[PDB]
């Protein structure tokens, strides 16, 4: 076995501008216990069947984990564009993995606003898929140069999420993880 509990049931979750990509390898994984949890809300699988992943499997079981607002969970899909999926976490086309999302109202929120999760709002060029871009460099909206001093065209990109406990279901912080499966030249696959 491998500790899926330290990535699914973790107390602290990374933001989407700094999404952690931990490598899971050389382990047996029970994905059938994930099905009958009756707690997820946006369990969608791309490129694989729920039954086909059990008997036949792949190695290279990298997992991605980040925090997404509820109305913009739908951006995390291959071939789907938007704001988060274009500037923060771009999924490649023919993505052979599943997205696992669930509500985090009672723990990823606090009264007065949980301003601990950030996201990139302005970027000079669109992100090529499966890329993390941690940077503090500010945007250039027009033509005048910015020397770090905020102005009318500088527009510091890292804006903070606000997660109040009384927010609507579309604005609820949906705690989401992404599993990526691919079978490249790396040998020694491990199944479930």
């Amino acid at each position: 076995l491998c500790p899926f509990g330290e990535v699914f049931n973790a107390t602290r979750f990374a933001s989407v501008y700094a999404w952690n990509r931990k490598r899971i390898s050389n382990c047996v994984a029970d994905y059938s216990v994930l099905y009958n949890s009756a707690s997820f809300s946006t369990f969608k699988c791309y490129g694989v069947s729920p039954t086909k992943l059990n008997d036949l499997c792949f190695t290279n079981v990298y997992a991605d984990s980040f925090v997404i607002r509820g109305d913009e969970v739908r951006q995390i899909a291959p071939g789907q564009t938007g704001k988060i999926a274009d500037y923060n976490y771009k999924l490649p086309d023919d993505f052979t993995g599943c997205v696992i999302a669930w509500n985090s109202n009672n723990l990823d929120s606090k009264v007065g606003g949980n301003y601990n999760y950030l996201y990139r709002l302005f970027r000079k060029s669109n992100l090529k898929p499966f890329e993390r871009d941690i940077s503090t460099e500010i945007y250039q909206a027009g033509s005048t140069p910015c020397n770090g001093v905020e102005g009318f065209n500088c527009y510091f990109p890292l804006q903070s999420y606000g997660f109040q406990p009384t927010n609507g279901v579309g604005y609820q912080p949906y705690r989401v993880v992404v599993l990526s499966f691919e079978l490249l030249h790396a040998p020694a696959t491990v199944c479930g």
Binding site: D71, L121, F122, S143, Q159, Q164, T166, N167, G168, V169
Partner: protein, 596 residues
């Protein structure tokens, strides 16, 4: 390297920044209206000041963007609303006259006084003291004193104050490149940039006046009939050849004539449509009152309420220490948070208000996909008239018999409908001349072609002409009784109530044709028709992103403010009133007859 792409970057920054600050101000204001403490007034003012100061910084930054090269219309409307300077054009010595005067208006209006001069027994506030003396008593002498208990004890200290208000707010228009402050309120109806859909600011004066020539023949017979059934209680105190006294029209100002229904009932022998006794037999509570309103909306096609609304809003009067006011208002806190703030009761009015206040919520989530600057109604009249078209449908006998409140065997003859329609006529038709006359007086005093000594002689002479009210006592120019009303003292545009009626019946005929109802508009219903729900929801979801004249063409097909589908609602009442007024003196001239 274009200004168009630079504005979209700034509006994307402003939309996320403002909705974080607007939710904090709305949450602080929500707690003030539920749990009143000494610190909660300061807590609401702390968040509201930094939100208002935030708009001061964003308005200055958006000023440097030129408006002559933005071909996109979605961001053009956002930049036009964000660049409204407002109070920033005035100097520091002049900006301090805004918050001092406006807070003085609210405190003066909050003083309830019905203590008799030279007889100081006791007196209560406005709600328990002032409303009972205009809606229940039938004595001419004390109601005339009660008329002078507020227009000579509260409005007398506004004459040097309100005139100071109308000489500096009028100066703001030249600094904001408007004509006058009355023209500033017409900027909500102003539409520019669309070919063939443009609405001039001066077109609103013409269109309101053009629609008033068909309101008048309905109002001629309504005023003629009500002057004959009011002189029965006052035989020798009013002459049935002239107009009506001001202190006999239901309220202190005569805005709503709902309290004249008991005095001027057409046929009181048969029982009225009243199910207040019916709900206490079936043990109705606050939860079941709003639950049937929710299932009414999902039957139309509108989405139902979220789970963060039933356990989050308040319904009854809570606790004993919470002395918060619970006037029925709709709350749009943003970020998916929607609340209703009212004290529920098992009555006719609170059940209809439950349908009425829910409609603003159903309008509020419709434009949730729109940006924050466009997260509003198409104008000031849309957000009020949308919340009232479901009030007309919920009061119908067909909808009342569908749930089971009304008796299963309730016949619908002539007199069972004239009693219902005249109750609707006193609250809808009766408020139209009062709304048009007061806003016409406010537009010219903001224009400035009314001198200081000619305020009252022109205000009273149009009430006698347009509304048709004889002054119960002569008043000189030192009185300031038109400013005593709630909306005029607190800087509220009152034209949104005149266009509320002309919008709430344009939508009613459009939705009834979508539901394919076979019959007149009074018996029509909206529920159990997803075709009518899809017609309404397409215009609700637009918000302010589209011009309001395009919102009419999405429902009624007429780009202008149509007045024809309102007389069709009152055709059963008007034809009976034309036969009832065969011998009565219908149509008043100028009348100084009773109080010369």
């Amino acid at each position: 390297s274009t200004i168009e792409e630079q504005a979209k970057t700034f509006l994307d920054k402003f939309n996320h920044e403002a909705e974080d600050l607007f939710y904090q101000s709305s949450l602080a204001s929500w707690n003030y209206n539920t749990n009143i403490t000494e610190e909660n007034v300061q807590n609401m003012n702390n968040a509201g000041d930094k939100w208002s100061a935030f708009l001061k910084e964003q308005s200055t930054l958006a000023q440097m963007y030129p408006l002559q090269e933005i071909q996109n219309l979605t961001v053009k409307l956002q930049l036009q609303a964000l660049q409204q300077n407002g109070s920033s054009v005035l100097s520091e010595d002049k900006s301090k006259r805004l918050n001092t005067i406006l807070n003085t208006m609210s405190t003066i209006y909050s003083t309830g006084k019905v203590c008799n001069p030279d007889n100081p027994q006791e007196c209560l506030l406005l709600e328990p003291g002032l409303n009972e003396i205009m809606a229940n008593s039938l004595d001419y002498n004390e109601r005339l004193w009660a008329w002078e208990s507020w227009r000579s004890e509260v409005g007398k200290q506004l004459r040097p104050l309100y005139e100071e208000y109308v000489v500096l707010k009028n100066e703001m228009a030249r600094a904001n490149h408007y004509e006058d402050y009355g023209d500033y309120w017409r900027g909500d109806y102003e539409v520019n940039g669309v070919d063939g859909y443009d609405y001039s600011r001066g077109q609103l004066i013409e269109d309101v006046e053009h629609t008033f020539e068909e309101i008048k023949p309905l109002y001629e017979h309504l005023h003629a009939y009500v002057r004959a059934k009011l002189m029965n209680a006052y035989p020798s105190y009013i002459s049935p050849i002239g107009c009506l006294p001001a202190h006999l029209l239901g309220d202190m100002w005569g805005r709503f004539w709902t309290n004249l229904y008991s005095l001027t009932v057409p046929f009181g022998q048969k029982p009225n449509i009243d199910v207040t006794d019916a709900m206490v037999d079936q043990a109705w509570d606050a939860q079941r009152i709003f639950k049937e309103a929710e299932k009414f909306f999902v039957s139309v096609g509108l989405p139902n309420m979220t789970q963060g609304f039933w356990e989050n809003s308040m319904l009854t009067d809570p606790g004993n220490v919470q002395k918060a006011v619970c006037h029925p208002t709709a709350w749009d806190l943003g970020k998916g948070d929607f609340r209703i703030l009212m004290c529920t009761k098992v009555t006719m009015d609170d059940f209809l208000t439950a349908h009425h206040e829910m409609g603003h919520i159903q309008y509020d989530m419709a434009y949730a996909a729109q940006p924050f600057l466009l997260r509003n109604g198409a104008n000031e009249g849309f957000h009020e008239a949308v919340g009232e078209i479901m009030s007309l449908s919920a009061a119908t006998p067909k909808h009342l018999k569908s749930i089971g409140l009304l008796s299963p065997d309730f016949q619908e003859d002539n007199e069972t409908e004239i009693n219902f329609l005249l109750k609707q006529a006193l609250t809808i038709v009766g408020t139209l001349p009062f709304t048009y006359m007061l806003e016409k007086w406010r537009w010219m005093v903001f224009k400035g072609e009314i001198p200081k000594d000619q305020w009252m002689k022109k205000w009273w002479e149009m009430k006698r002409e347009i509304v048709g009210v004889v002054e119960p006592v002569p008043h000189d120019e030192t009185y300031c009784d038109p400013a005593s009303l709630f909306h005029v003292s607190n800087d509220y545009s009152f034209i949104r109530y005149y266009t509320r009626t002309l919008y709430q019946f344009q939508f009613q005929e459009a939705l009834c044709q979508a539901a394919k109802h076979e019959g007149p508009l009074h018996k029509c219903d909206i529920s159990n028709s997803t075709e009518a729900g899809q017609k309404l929801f397409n215009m609700l979801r637009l918000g302010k992103s589209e011009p309001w004249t395009l919102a009419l063409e999405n429902v009624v097909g007429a780009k202008n403010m149509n007045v024809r589908p309102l007389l069709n609602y009152f055709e059963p009442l008007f034809t009976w009133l034309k036969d009832q007024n065969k011998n009565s003196f219908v149509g008043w001239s100028t009348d100084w007859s009773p109080y010369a």
